[PDB]
Each structure stands twice: as C-alpha cells, then as structure tokens.
C-alpha cells in the first residue's frame, strides 16, 4: 500500500493527498509530529525531513509537486493531469512553478508576518491572485481540459483563504472573484473534498503561530 507521511496543515501535503485521491489509489495517511520526525521519514529525507512523502515499493518519493508528477506517472491509464502536447505540459509546470514562488511566499507573509512586512505580502498576494485570475481566464481548471496538474497545485491553498481574509482583514474576492470561485468549484472533486482539513482549524493553526511570534 502507499504510505503517506503528511501533516494536517500542509498545503503541500494536501497536494499529495489530492493527487493520490484524484487518480484513484487507496492509501494510508500518517500524521507527523515534526518535533519527533518518525524513523521512516528520517530515512525518506534525512536532511530536509520535509513532507509529503509517498513510499511505494519501499521507495520514498518527496517534494509535493514532484509527488503529483509521481502520482501521474505511477498510474498512466485513467486520469492524466497534463495534456498530450509537450508545450501545454510545459505551461502547467511553468504555472505550477508560479504557484511555488511569490504566491506561496506572499501568503506566508500575510498569515505569518505583520506591519511593514504585512502590507508587502498583502500587495503580493492580490497581484498573485490577479495574474492568477487572468491566466484562469475561461478554463474550468488549469493544466488540462479537465482537472489538471496545477489544479491540484493551488486548490489546497483554498483552505487558507479564510485565514488570509481574517488576519489580513481583507476580502480577496472583490478584487479577484473568479479564483476562490474556481476553488470551491474544484472542491467538488473527492480528491480535495476529503483531502483538506477544516479551514477554521487552519485559521486556528495560523492563530497559534501568530500568537507565538509577536
């Protein structure tokens, strides 16, 4: 069976759960206490000790966007995430890599930092969601005619959207509606509809961090 080493507040971890559930593999979840990284994890990635990790055939597969590539390639017969052309594949890796830079880091600023730091990542995330909303443009999704690669990549970010609107004291929808819009659209898939934690608790996890570093 595929064993996942995940962490309930990991947008990344969720990328793997969503990835696995999307294709249609039954798998076991394991909850990490990162204060105590478990013996099979420190043997999966002895230096990063980072997750999500998928152990298949006694082989640890790590880094989340990598893991979903792995999800694709491990079972190449039903639900592909890429299209058949190499270029569209390149598009979906491109925009996946867009998700991993200013976007992830901006949200990290907005529920992790305050003040002078806060408004920068605050103007970062709207710009991010704004280019985001342009590139979504029309497609129900992102990296295919159906549920694609990067659809998995940033759908797991849509449970933090509550924590953003609250610490940020914002509303990321009036500036760019069609994104969060598409997000709860994507939530209908059981890939993410069973693979993402409750957002109020996420809000509470952000709240814990926020109260811890002031």
């Amino acid at each position: 069976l595929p064993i996942l080493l995940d962490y309930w507040p990991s947008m990344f971890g969720m990328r793997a759960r969503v990835a696995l559930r999307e294709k249609g593999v039954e798998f076991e979840y394991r909850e990490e206490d990162f204060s105590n990284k478990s013996p099979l994890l420190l043997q999966s990635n002895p230096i990063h000790k980072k997750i999500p990790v998928l152990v298949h055939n006694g082989k640890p597969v790590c880094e989340s966007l990598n893991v979903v590539q792995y999800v694709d390639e491990a079972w190449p017969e039903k639900n592909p995430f890429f299209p058949s052309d190499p270029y569209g594949r390149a598009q979906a890796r491109f925009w996946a890599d867009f998700v991993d830079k200013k976007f992830t880091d901006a949200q990290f600023k907005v529920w992790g930092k305050k003040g002078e730091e806060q408004e920068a990542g605050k103007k970062e995330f709207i710009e991010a969601v704004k280019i985001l909303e342009s590139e979504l443009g029309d497609k129900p999704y992102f990296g295919g005619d159906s549920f694609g690669y990067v659809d998995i990549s940033l759908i797991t970010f849509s449970s933090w959207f509550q924590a953003y609107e609250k610490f940020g004291n914002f509303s990321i929808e009036s500036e760019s509606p069609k994104l969060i819009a598409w997000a709860k659209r994507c939530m209908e898939k059981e890939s993410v509809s069973k693979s993402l934690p409750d957002s109020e608790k996420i809000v509470a996890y952000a709240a814990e961090y926020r109260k811890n570093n002031l």
């Binding site: 449970s159 959207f161 509550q162 609107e165 609250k166 509303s171 929808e173 009036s174 509606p177 069609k178 969060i180 819009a181 598409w182 997000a183 709860k184 659209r185 939530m187 209908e188 509809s193 993402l196 409750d198 957002s199 109020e200």
Partner: protein
Amino acid sequence: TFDMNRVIDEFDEMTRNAHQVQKQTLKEILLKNQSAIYLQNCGLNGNATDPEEAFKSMVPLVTDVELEPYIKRMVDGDTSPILTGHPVPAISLSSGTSQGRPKFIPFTDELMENTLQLFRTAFAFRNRDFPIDDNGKALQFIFSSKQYISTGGVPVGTATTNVYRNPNFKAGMKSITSPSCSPDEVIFSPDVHQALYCHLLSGILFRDQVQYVFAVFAHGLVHAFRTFEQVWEEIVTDIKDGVLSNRITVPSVRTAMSKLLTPNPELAETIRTKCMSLSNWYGLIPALFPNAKYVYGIMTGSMEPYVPKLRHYAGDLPLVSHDYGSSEGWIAANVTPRLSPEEATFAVIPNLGYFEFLPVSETGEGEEKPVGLTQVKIGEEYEVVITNYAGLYRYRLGDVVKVIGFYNNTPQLKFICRRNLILSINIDKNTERDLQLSVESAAKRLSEEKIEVIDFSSYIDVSTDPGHYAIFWEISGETNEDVLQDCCNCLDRAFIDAGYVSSRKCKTIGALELRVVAKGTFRKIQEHFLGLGSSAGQFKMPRCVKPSNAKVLQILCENVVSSYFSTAF
C-alpha cells in the same frame, strides 16, 4: 373561549352532523363564492335542488398544471381574483411538482379560523388525555420568520408564517397553548438556524413548566436533538457567562438574547453532570423537561423512519401523532391522541371543505366515480379529491389514504404514504441535478467549517432587469460573509450546460443571487406538506420556483441570513 367539554360536545355533535355540515360546507363555499370564472365555464349559479349532483356532474377535475396559470394571474401584477375569488392575502406551493413545475394555492382568513378551531379542539382531546398546567409553557420548535411580497406587490405565503405573523394568531392561541418559550422576534428572527439555537435555548429556559416538546415532525425533533448533541457544551458557555455566543450576529435577536442574560456560573455544573451521564443520549427528552406528558408531531407515513431515532430521543415518553390538514384544505383530527404512532389515525372534521375520494378498488388504479366521505369503504384505499376555501374545487391532490374506522359518524384515516410521485417535464430546473450540483459545489466552502448541506431550493425573478436566479440553502451552521460571497459566485459558476453560460456571460438574464436561509426552513416545507390535507404522498421538495410556486417562497426572503449577488461577472 377555550374549554374542554363544551367544544368536544359540539364536536361530537358536529362529527355526527358530518353530512349536514359537509353539505353546508359546500353551500358556504359557493354562496360566498358564486362568482368564479372557473365555474362559469361549468355553468354554475348556486342554490337549486340538485346542487350537490350538479356539482359532481358538471365540474371536471383539475390538475396542478391547469391550476397553475389562474392563481398565477392572481399573484403577478394583475392582482386579479379567479378560481375561488378574492385576491388572497397569501398563496401556496405544493409538494411533488406541477409537471416538475410550480403550483399556486390561495390563502384566506377562513383558513385561519380552520386553524384555530382544529387546534382548540385537537388540544382539548389531547389535554383530555395528556393534561397540562395552565401556568406553564412549551418547547415548540416553531418558526415563521420569513415574509416577502410577491412580484405583483401582493403577499403570498406559507402555512406556518401565515399562521404566526397573522393578527389573530396571538390573541386566539393564547388560551390553547402553554406560552411560547421564545420571543416572537426570535421566532420571527432573520436568522432562524441561530434562532433554532435560541429556540433550544428558549425551550430549555422555562423547562420546569414545559408540558411538551413540539415539532410538527419527528425529523424536526430529531434534527433538534442531534443538533443538541453537537452544541450542548457551547450552549452552556452561552448562557453561562451571560454572553451569547459569537455565533449570534443578527442585531434584533442579539438584543433580545441580551435582554435575557447576566453572568451565572452555577448551572453549568448541573447540566454537564446530567448530559455526560447518559447512554448515547437515549431518553434525552424526559431528561430535559421530565414532566412532559408528551412528545408531539405527526407519526405516520413517510416519517415513520423518524419515530425510532426520536423514540431513542423521547425515551419512554408517549409519542402522540399530530392531526392532518393544510392550507390547500385541512382534513382531520386525532381526538384519541393516546393511540400509538403505528396505529394513529385522524378523523375528518366536516366544515373543512368539500372532499370526495377516488377509490383504487379494481386494480391500479380503476375507473370509478366518487362516493361521499361516509359513502367511503372501511379498509379500502382512496385518493383525496379536494374542495375548499383555498383555491381548490374537487381538485386532485393525488395521494392515497385508508379508512381504518369511524369515530361515530365520521370516518377515520390511515397514511401509509410518502410521495404523490410521478412527475413531468420541468423548466425551473437549470437542470435539477445542476441546481443541486451548484448547491453541493459551492457548499463545501461551508463544509470547510465541519458542516454538510442539509437542504436547498431556488426561484426565478422576472421583476428585475436583468431577471435573476435565487438560490436558497439550509445548513447546520453559521459562517462569516466572505465565503458566502465565494459561495454565491459558485452557484453562478455551477450550471454546466452551455445555455446558462450564454445568458449570464452576456448578461441578458441576471447574475445569480444566493440568499442563504436558515435551519428548519425546508423542514417547515416538509412539515407543512405531509400533514397537508390529502394523503402523506407529499414529500418532495420541488427544488426550483417559477413565479407560480409560493409556499417555499414565504419562507424565502425575510431570513436572508445572507443574500449576496455575485461580485464575479
């Protein structure tokens, strides 16, 4: 003035009089309303000396579809009187569907008289069996907090809301109930799921004098008590520190709850003790107010599944079955409320309206002409055909009941039903599957908050330009506004067909407005439909409202717990 023995004697008298007053009911329904254009097609003028025969030989039966357009002329700009007459003070919807579509039904104050009387009388026989205290109160999970005005500028309305916000509800029910545990403003609160919470709270308040727990339906009770299992610790916390929970947002209900509250620590100890002392919450109802004579509500037909989990809820306490009538015409009373739910039956009170039945005697169905209510046969199954003061005249409501016996001269009735189910081809749908899909797709945004979507409905507005879609949901919890906007955005985004896409991408039909409404809203719909006069084949819900569907609609506008137009588009 409500007494026990004089009314029942008048009612025994009355029930034995069943023929004179069935016939007089007919006199009155047409003497008041000789003027129907419907009947002009029939060639009616009243009086005569073959009046009953001239009615059962000259007027054709009518269906939901042929009945749609006339009352439709009543409600929308043309404030015009038609099938019965009067441009009525409220209008209806009907369980099952009018070819998939909306069915309109008129309300008149007459129907309110019918209400009160059924309820003085039903309460007489019950307190005759399940006697109460006259200085006590009740746990009534009743709401009627929503009240719109139709696109014609005419009000149109649900049973419950038309009962409770009516002028004579409060004066008239005062002698026939134990004082409602909740302020009328929280009964009539814009946020009713929160009000449901403050309805537990309220019914839980004067618990010692409470003589019964009430919902129209066991599922009403069962959702109230499974809800209790969810939030009991929170409720402690609410009343405890004198501060209602942050869950509560709407101002008037918040001011009302604060109008009742101060910091009071002592009672938490007690409630925590008893609540954790039980076995998975069996017998929680006698546990709450242990001096209730009963749990009350309808207990036959398509709710029989809800008797067990509620029996688990009610413990050893007697489950009394609620009587049987509606706005489309009230039918019956259980004057022996002591009978078990499984054997429970409701006897027909004769000035209700003028009812004939279509016997199934032959095979399924069988081509027989109607016989009178006391010309009906015992043990046989007939479907109720309705004539009353509510837009209905020898109408086919389309649902099957059995006669088990006679309470003196009036036949007793048994419901083994559920659905008046066969449908036909719709146009409110935007595909029903889409409608539901849209609900579900947007909903999980809420489901992030540990909830699932318990119910849903919708409506089309051509009063506006561009005319727009209206989505209504029922959920288990409250949530902040941002997600609700996100949510409305997805109902706008969840109709997969090319067409909807064309209309609101151009903008010739309006953006979709999701007005999320509260808990029990659709329970109201179920509860007012199955008890509705005909036969339990009533359970339903039409999921989308053309201008010609109304009952769900009274329950639609005022309790915009949130109503948001898409900031998308």
